[PDB]
Amino acid sequence: MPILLFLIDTSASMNQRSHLGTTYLDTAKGAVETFMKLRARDPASRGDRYMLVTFEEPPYAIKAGWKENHATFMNELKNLQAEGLTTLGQSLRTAFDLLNLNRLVTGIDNYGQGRNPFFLEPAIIITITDGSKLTTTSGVQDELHLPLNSPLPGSELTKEPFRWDQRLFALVLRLPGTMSVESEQLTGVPLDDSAITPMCEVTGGRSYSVCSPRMLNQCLESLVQKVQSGVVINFEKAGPDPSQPWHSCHKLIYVRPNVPIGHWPVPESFWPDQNSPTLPPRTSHPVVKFSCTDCEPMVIDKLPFDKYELEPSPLTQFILERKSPQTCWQVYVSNS
Amino acid sequence: KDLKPQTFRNAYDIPRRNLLDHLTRMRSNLLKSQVHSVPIAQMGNYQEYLKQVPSPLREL
Amino acid sequence: GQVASLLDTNRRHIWSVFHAGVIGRGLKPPKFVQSRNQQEVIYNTQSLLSLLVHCCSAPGCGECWGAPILSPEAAKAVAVTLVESVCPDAAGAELAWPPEEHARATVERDLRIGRRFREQPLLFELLKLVAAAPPALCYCSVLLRGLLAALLGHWEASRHPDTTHSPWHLEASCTLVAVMAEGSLLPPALGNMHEVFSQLAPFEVRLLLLSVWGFLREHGPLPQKFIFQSERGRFIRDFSREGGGEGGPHLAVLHSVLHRNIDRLGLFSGRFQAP
Amino acid sequence: TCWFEFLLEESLLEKHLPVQLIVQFLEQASKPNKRNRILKLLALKVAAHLKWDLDILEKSLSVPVLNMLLNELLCISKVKHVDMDLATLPPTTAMAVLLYNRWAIRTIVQSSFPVKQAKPQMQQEKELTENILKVLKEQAADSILVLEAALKLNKDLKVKTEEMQCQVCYDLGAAYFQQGSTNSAVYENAREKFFRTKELIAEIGSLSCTIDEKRLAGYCQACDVLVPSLTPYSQVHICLRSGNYQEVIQIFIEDNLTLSLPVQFRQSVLRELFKKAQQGNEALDEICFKVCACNTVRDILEGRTISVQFNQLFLRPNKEKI
Amino acid sequence: DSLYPIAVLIDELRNEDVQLRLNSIKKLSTIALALGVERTRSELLPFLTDDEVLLALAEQLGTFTTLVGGPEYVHCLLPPLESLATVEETVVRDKAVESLRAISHEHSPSDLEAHFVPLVKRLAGGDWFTSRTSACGLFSVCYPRVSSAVKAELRQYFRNLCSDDTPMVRRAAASKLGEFAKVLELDNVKSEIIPMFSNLASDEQDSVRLLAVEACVNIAQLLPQEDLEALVMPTLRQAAEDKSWRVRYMVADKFTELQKAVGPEITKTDLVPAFQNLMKDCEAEVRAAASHKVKEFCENLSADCRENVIMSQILPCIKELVSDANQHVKSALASVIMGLSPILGKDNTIEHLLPLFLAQLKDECPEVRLNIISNLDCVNEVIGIRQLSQSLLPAIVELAEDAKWRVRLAIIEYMPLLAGQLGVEFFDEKLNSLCMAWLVDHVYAIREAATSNLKKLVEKFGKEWAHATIIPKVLAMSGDPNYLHRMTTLFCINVLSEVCGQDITTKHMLPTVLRMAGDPVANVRFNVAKSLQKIGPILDNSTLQSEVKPILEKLTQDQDVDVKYFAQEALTVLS
Amino acid sequence: FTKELDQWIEQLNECKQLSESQVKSLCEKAKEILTKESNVQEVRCPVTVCGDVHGQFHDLMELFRIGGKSPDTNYLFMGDYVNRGYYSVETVTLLVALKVRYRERITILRGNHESRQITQVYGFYDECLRKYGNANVWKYFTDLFDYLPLTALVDGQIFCLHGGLSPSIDTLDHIRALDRLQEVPHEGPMCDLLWSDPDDRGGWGISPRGAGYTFGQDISETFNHANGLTLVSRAHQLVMEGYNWCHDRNVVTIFSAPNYCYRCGNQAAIMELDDTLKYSFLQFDPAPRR
Ligand SMILES: [Mn+2]
Ligand SMILES: [Mn+2]
């Protein structure tokens, strides 16, 4: 069952009036309730965990976590006050820690024993914020830097705060004070240009820059469409063409349960040896490299093999454009 | 915010502006002769209030 | 411009008090009504405006009947301090006029401007002083648009069969059209509709003010529309060279209003002719 | 007292001795042949029971129902209007044709009139009215020509010859007044038709048909100033047109005693005199000062503020000014 | 084709809006007047034979007497009402049944047996249960006019309908069985109805047994006195301990006339075990239903044996019915228990009902207290004021300060009863602090009841007691800052002027009313005008034009419209 | 006229509905009376502020027995006169008759159930059809409902209102400038005036009703200090205790329909304001019905 963790901006810049007459924090809360309504339209969300993290101090930052019911989540979402600073990096670190603290005690990560795509706890972080500067009570930052000062035990085994099955999505509120007349707002939503955008893109997510309530509803529908169960795999071009954008992509593969079943792990980036005392840190997204040279799919009878459907991406568009289902593109991780 | 003025138990919580009215209310309370500030979500408890209330008889 | 409790509490009182409390701090004081003499207000205003005209006029026979030209820069200074005093926020500070559907977006600001104009009658005199210099009234466009939208909103909700039951709103609409005509933001045919405003129901005068908004949308109160006639030293707005500047489609609503109320507006038809 | 009951009997309409019956019959007849013809005949009968008074039917019945009723009236009579010429036609068909053209020209005048907008079937009816209005815009000149021919052909139930001519020339004058906004030359024909109906109404003196006397008086007052070919207001307008500005000054001085002219009218003429003086005509500065002084004196006598132009005109006081 | 009313005009309004369909159905009388009386029954009724539309159709066809032509051709209405009787919807069904019942009055007995009884033949023998239920509801009106040879057929068909395998046919037969038995011959009742009544009383469904018990009192009423114990009483005995609670609740609800029907000697021997069982049933609903009729069952017994049947069974069960777990049973008992005292007798009321009365007067349910207070007059009449003042007076003084205002209203309404039999000194030292404290109550109805009670108190205990006790307390409300206390003291003026005479009124009550006419609240001022109108004819006529008229003109010159209206009304009535 | 109005009032006291011509002459006179009243109608103390009646006529009779008879007791009803009460027609007719007969002794405000769609959905239209056969009386009452004042102001301190506040409304001058002579829109300041609720929350929010907003304590405090108000009376929500203080006694919600829907079992209350705004609450049970 999925985890929906909302990283609500509670910095004081969220007390900005829109043309609606309500503050950005009011729009954030309403965006959360409309997201939950659209999620409850999907009848597969009968089991779904909602978590709330604000920008406040780490004693007060996590408002709803594990073992918090729906009533507490709603009663604490309503009672949010935007009276803090724009501590985006610290809040992101606390959100990823709240997602990842159970990983080592229940062993989803499967460290040193291969990367199992069926060993996943699918979570996405929807951070709702504005384009204001990040502040850390000494000045502005103008670049997002997640602090590494009090590491959770075992954080060095992955070298990145986010994990395989976690995607960060930004819902950047840019509603102006006066309503803007625009007929091109029915087109696709642009990517935002704030510091949260590269951190969203490195986790396999994206940032949404809204400018109107209808654009907000469009982004919320798109975000509801992106609540899936899968893991993010970094695909790379190994050889030459059979730089174009399909060369590299942090795409999502799909892990459909029946609990998921599977047999083979994605191999590690190292060769295991008993001489090494410390396990090497692996990237959170396994850098796989596909061979552009055409090969032949090799399947025998009664064979335990796992098939994972890639989400739509420039890589899948490139593969389906070269219409040839009878062939295949071999993939491998480096230094294995 | 969580002041919780125990005005009937502490005399220091009583303002001077309503000292006499609160005084005679305390006098009426102690002798033989706040509430209705339910936090909104529970003031319209359809199922909860009737559950504590006794059930009536049923129809013919 | 406009503008021992416990002793007798115990003396007033199984003998509990009837009421459960007090709402606020008892009853409010009975208003703050005051009256000043209208004559002394008129002549204090005359002193202030004569000082402003002396400051605004260009020093230095030009005929025995001529008048010195009020400087557009001095009246521009009066215009910008008027805008900053009345509507300081100026979120719509750009001089060209928005669509009429923007009037519901800024109801609070426009009602603040209207209430400010109602409380201080000196604001209308200051706009008349500004409008005596032609390019300066362009810089009061936010104030004019806000007062016009407040008046339009008032004539939306006026349920009276006539207009005389709203005396301030009627004379404010008349004065607003008179100032915009005097500042030559309106052509003389369209700038004369304030004379008939007293003879109309609220929806006709609302439609006429909407036609004024439409003209100021199509033409705009912009200082580059004013050509400095160096022969007399005054900036001149030529509506003929603008193209449709005599109210092409905008006079149709006015003529239809005259036609509908021709039993009362027949004698007023000379003020709205094409020449 | 319903739609079904009136179709049953052929004599209950006399027992009823109605515009609601008109709209009910024409709504039932147009709903998606003997019954339709019977309902149409009943509607025409009760429409004739009101003696074809277009005012009551115009205010009660809407545009498309009244259009359908008069189309049925023309359909049963003769069944193209411009070439009929109303000469050899029967009097019933002739009065029906001129009545239809009167209604058409009345509705094309009345559609220009502003109306209060509703705050929040009906859309289809609005589209039908818009289509009818556009069609009669395409055929307004033919209706005008038919009405003019009927005014010229005063050959002869049967009503008074002058009264129908008076009504049709009153509607023609209203049409010409409505047209005169675009072209000022049409106001001459408007004044001619309004003088014609004023003379006819004075001649006959019969209530019968019925026209708005106050509207006719206002039309005459408007035509007396738009095309003049009296009151101090018209005297000021005439002397403004003729350039006799000294007489305007004299009328304003005399009006300061009586306070008969509107204050806003005097402000408007002061404003237009300043606008004329600021372009050229350097002799108009004296006129502007004189009318500004008169307006300032009247403002004083009515307890209002001294204008900015008066303070501008005493920046340089003179013996002549004072 | 187009001008034909029934063929075209009726048909074309059936595709309109449903409200237009209702209007066209309601306007069927004009269509009937359009066609001939032959043409109507020849065309429209065959068309009509082939849910508000059907309800209005059946309502119109019920009052379709003169439109078809008259009584000679009313039988043409039988096929369309037969068509609507077969409709699955049920309010259409019994509307059609009552329409048939209404139009049965205009038939002839020969026409009845010719046409209307073949309808019973078709509906009873119909394959659908709806027709059978309509036939069961239809039997009542055909019986008195037809001959005996077809009366036997009607009885046999009723018996066959009561033996239907579907349950709702038996339900509709049993619900209408009482009306059928009210007219059917008493010699044939014992022959036909009561065995089949016993069979439907022994039905396998509790829903059928409900309507079986519902008609039991009528069967016992119609059957003679000498055969109740062997024909209707075994059925009542079987239904008394029936398994379902619905049927037992139905048994308990009908004792108050079942006892009258089955004759008192049978009641005193046979009903009181069943009645005592229904006192002590394991469930609340039948307990409350049977405890409603305790007084009604007790008062309709034999005079010589009335006390023993109470003391042996009823009152011992009353002792725990007072302490019942469910407060609905206690409130049901409390409305009828306290009238048992004239039946029971004063000498034995004191030791038995008085502790029960005191137990019920302190019950936490306000309905129990409201029900028990409202019947104090019987106990006051049959016992006396000394014992009442000893026992019940502290209790009623205690709950005169009840939270619920209807209890206090009943207490105020019964204060004149206590004031009737009590002296002025005892009533002063016991019963006037509350009588004056009711005037400053939070509920308007309480203050109004106390105001109307002041008149009853004054007219008995004297002008001197009025001036000594009530007048200072009422005058204390004049200067009160709260507005409705001032309106209360003017209502006290209104009720006290008529009972304080002329001189006392004009020298005490009048100056206060003239004084408070300058009150800044208009609700006080127009009440001053109304009070001056009301007390005008009562007060001394010498002071009327001297004092009242100037202040009435002053109130007529007030700013508020209502004050002016009531002031000019006072001026016109006072004259 | 006045005698006819009094006869109509004493007829409507025992739930006899008026005729069609009576509804004509009553609604078209209430239109004349309610036209003169502003959106923020100045109610002078004393007045008894009442909540939703919701068509429960016998509960309205209980309300009159508790608080007093009109015109003796000044009443101020905050909308919702209709819609799923068994006698909504009689209730709204009686209160409109009291408004016509005593224009200064009762002020009736518009609630959210006085829209055409809301009465069409929730049984007022069906009640008019059942009790009168035609449908002209329903649209007559909705045309009257278009004329009802939106808000009330007691002494410039207590701001009586059916619903709550609006994001687009910051002043009472905005409310006075609203064109109230219209059908209640799905969005806007008027819809927010008639439909909003308070909440224990940190600002604005979308109401669960699908119309209007919901607001917290800070919004109520800002509105009260920005307008010189001490209290905002409210009636749109159901209270089991009859009345309920909210937002540190800045907004009080008053429900005046005891045993709402004939099933909720609530125990309603009315708020009596004294001569000097010394408030009092009179809770009352549902009336017995026989
Ligand atoms: Mn409600
Ligand atoms: Mn409501």
UniProtKB/Swiss-Prot annotation, chain A:
Subcellular location: Nucleus; Chromosome
Superkingdom as given in the UniProt entry: Eukaryota
Domain VWFA: 3-227
Organ and tissue specificity: Widely expressed. Expressed in heart, brain, placenta, lung, liver, skeletal muscle, kidney and pancreas.
Induction remarks: Frequently down-regulated in nonsmall cell lung carcinomas and prostate cancers. Down-regulation in prostate cancer is due to CpG hypermethylation of its promoter. However, some involvement in cancer is unclear.
Subunit structure: Component of the Integrator complex, composed of core subunits INTS1, INTS2, INTS3, INTS4, INTS5, INTS6, INTS7, INTS8, INTS9/RC74, INTS10, INTS11/CPSF3L, INTS12, INTS13, INTS14 and INTS15. The core complex associates with protein phosphatase 2A subunits PPP2CA and PPP2R1A, to form the Integrator-PP2A (INTAC) complex.
Role, per record: Component of the integrator complex, a multiprotein complex that terminates RNA polymerase II (Pol II) transcription in the promoter-proximal region of genes.
Family membership noted in the UniProt record: Belongs to the Integrator subunit 6 family.
Name of the protein described by the UniProt record: Integrator complex subunit 6
Lineage start: Eukaryota, Metazoa, Chordata, Craniata, Vertebrata
Gene transcribed to yield this protein: INTS6
Part of the full-length chain shown: 1 to 355 of 887
Swiss-Prot record, chain C:
Superkingdom per UniProt: Eukaryota
Location relative to the cell: Nucleus; Cytoplasm; Nucleus membrane
Segments passing through the bilayer: 122-142, 196-216
Functional description taken from the UniProt entry: Component of the integrator complex, a multiprotein complex that terminates RNA polymerase II (Pol II) transcription in the promoter-proximal region of genes.
Family: Belongs to the Integrator subunit 5 family.
Quaternary structure and interacting proteins, as annotated: Component of the Integrator complex, composed of core subunits INTS1, INTS2, INTS3, INTS4, INTS5, INTS6, INTS7, INTS8, INTS9/RC74, INTS10, INTS11/CPSF3L, INTS12, INTS13, INTS14 and INTS15. The core complex associates with protein phosphatase 2A subunits PPP2CA and PPP2R1A, to form the Integrator-PP2A (INTAC) complex.
Protein name: Integrator complex subunit 5
Organism: Homo sapiens (Human)
Range covered out of full length: 707 to 1009 of 1019
Swiss-Prot record, chain D:
Keywords: Chromosome, Disease variant, Intellectual disability, Nucleus, Phosphoprotein, Repeat, TPR repeat
Location of the protein in the cell: Nucleus; Chromosome
Positions occupied by motif WFEF motif: 3-8
GO cellular component: chromatin; INTAC complex; integrator complex; nucleoplasm; nucleus
GO biological process: protein localization to chromatin; regulation of transcription elongation by RNA polymerase II; RNA polymerase II transcription initiation surveillance; snRNA 3'-end processing; snRNA processing
TPR repeats: 166-204, 230-263
Predominant place of localization: nucleus
Quaternary data: Component of the Integrator complex, composed of core subunits INTS1, INTS2, INTS3, INTS4, INTS5, INTS6, INTS7, INTS8, INTS9/RC74, INTS10, INTS11/CPSF3L, INTS12, INTS13, INTS14 and INTS15. The core complex associates with protein phosphatase 2A subunits PPP2CA and PPP2R1A, to form the Integrator-PP2A (INTAC) complex.
Disease: Neurodevelopmental disorder with cerebellar hypoplasia and spasticity: An autosomal recessive neurodevelopmental disorder characterized by global developmental delay, profound intellectual disability, seizures, absent speech, spasticity, facial and limb dysmorphism, and subtle structural brain abnormalities including cerebellar hypoplasia.
Domain notes: The WFEF motif is required for the recruitment of protein phosphatase 2A (PP2A) to transcription pause-release checkpoint.
Similarity field: Belongs to the Integrator subunit 8 family.
UniProtKB/Swiss-Prot annotation, chain E:
Main location (coarse class): cytoplasm
PROSITE patterns (alphabetical): HEAT_REPEAT
One GO location term (cellular component): mitochondrion
Recorded consequence of changing residue 246 to H: In HJS2; reduces PPP2CA binding; reduces PPP2R5A binding; reduces PPP2R5C binding; does not affect PPP2R5D binding; reduces PPP2R2A binding; reduces PPP2R2B binding; reduces PPP2R3A binding; does not affect phosphatase activity of PPP2CA
Keywords: Acetylation, Cell membrane, Cell projection, Centromere, Chromosome, Chromosome partition, Cytoplasm, Disease variant, Host-virus interaction, Intellectual disability, Membrane, Nucleus, Repeat
Effect of residue 486 to L: In HJS2; likely pathogenic; disrupts interaction with PPP2R5D and PPP2CA
Family statement: Belongs to the phosphatase 2A regulatory subunit A family.
Entry domain remark: Each HEAT repeat appears to consist of two alpha helices joined by a hydrophilic region, the intrarepeat loop. The repeat units may be arranged laterally to form a rod-like structure.
PANTHER family: SERINE/THREONINE-PROTEIN PHOSPHATASE PP2A 65 KDA REGULATORY SUBUNIT, SERINE_THREONINE-PROTEIN PHOSPHATASE 2A 65 KDA REGULATORY SUBUNIT A ALPHA ISOFORM
Disease tied to this protein: Houge-Janssens syndrome 2: An autosomal dominant disorder characterized by global developmental delay, hypotonia, variably impaired intellectual development, poor speech, and dysmorphic facial features. Some patients may develop seizures.
Protein's UniProt name: Serine/threonine-protein phosphatase 2A 65 kDa regulatory subunit A alpha isoform
